[PDB]
Structure formats: C-alpha cells, structure tokens
Amino acid sequence: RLDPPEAEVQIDRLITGRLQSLQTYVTQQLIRAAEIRASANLAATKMSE
Amino acid sequence: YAWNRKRISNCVADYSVLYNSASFSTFKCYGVSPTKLNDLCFTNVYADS
Ligand SMILES: *[C@@H]1O[C@H](CO)[C@@H](O[C@@H]2O[C@H](CO)[C@@H](O[C@@H]3O[C@H](CO)[C@@H](O)[C@H](O)[C@@H]3O)[C@H](O)[C@H]2NC(C)=O)[C@H](O)[C@H]1NC(C)=O
Numbered sequence: 776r777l778d779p780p781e782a783e784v785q786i787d788r789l790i791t792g793r794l795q796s797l798q799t800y801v802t803q804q805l806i807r808a809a810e811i812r813a814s815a816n817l818a819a820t821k822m823s824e
Numbered sequence: 825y826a827w828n829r830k831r832i833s834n835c836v837a838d839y840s841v842l843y844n845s846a847s848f849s850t851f852k853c854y855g856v857s858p859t860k861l862n863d864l865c866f867t868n869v870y871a872d873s
Pocket residue numbers: 841842844845846
C-alpha cells in the first residue's frame with residue numbers, strides 16, 4: 776500500500792514490537808528452563824539415592 | 825459548508841490516468857501511495873467535492 780520511504784516507518788514499528796515480544800518469550804523460557812533443570816537435578820538425585 | 829458526497833462501487837477504477845493528468849495542482853495521498861492505487865481493492869470509495 777505504501778512506497779518504501781513511507782513503509783519503512785510502519786515496518787520499523789512492527790519490527791520493534793515483534794522483537795520485544797520475542798525477547799520477552801525467550802527470557803520467560805530461559806527462567807522456566809532453569810526451573811525445570813533444577814527439578815531434573817532433584818529427580819536424578821532421587822533416582823540415584 | 826455543504827460539501828457534496830458521492831458514492832462509487834461496483835466498478836473498476838483506473839487511477840493511472842487521473843494521476844498522469846497533470847492538471848491537478850495538488851495530488852496528496854496519506855493512507856496509500858499514489859502509484860499503488862492501481863493494484864489495490866476497496867469495499868467502496870467516497871468522493872467528496
Ligand atoms: C476531464 O476531461 C479531460 C480532457 O479530456 C480528461 O483529461 C484527459 O482527456 C483525454 C481525452 O479526453 C483522455 O484520453 C486521452 O487521449 C489522448 C489521445 O486523444 C491521449 O494522448 C492521452 O494520453 C489520453 O489518453 C485522458 O484519459 C484524460 N486524462 C489524461 C490525458 O491524463 C480528464 O480525464 C477528464 N476527467 C476524468 C475524471 O475523466
């Protein structure tokens with residue numbers, strides 16, 4: 776709908792929003808993975824003992 | 825103060841000729857670029873004169 780010079784602004788807004796969403800998702804996943812790793816270590820210790 | 829409003833639908837619009845007609849002193853589009861109008865589709869177009 777827009778020529779490149781005008782489109783760039785909307786494209787940048789979308790890029791910023793989606794990058795923020797991806798960063799939030801990845802951070803949440805990292806924290807959840809740390810929790811699951813703690814649980815897995817506990818389970819491994821439970822097995823071994 | 826009594827600007828006249830006209831409705832246009834059920835037709836094919838060739839904006840190329842209108843844009844190429846240099847008789848228009850000001851030809852300014854905001855939501856869409858003038859060039860791309862020939863490729864878009866609209867539910868209906870209002871013309872206020
Ligand atoms: C309002 O009237 C004017 C004058 O006709 C329109 O401008 C241009 O008028 C010509 C002929 O009426 C349209 O066809 C032209 O034919 C010549 C060959 O005779 C050709 O060399 C031109 O390139 C053009 O195809 C033309 O479509 C039209 N617009 C242009 C030249 O940009 C005007 O279109 C009329 N307003 C509306 C909304 O139609």
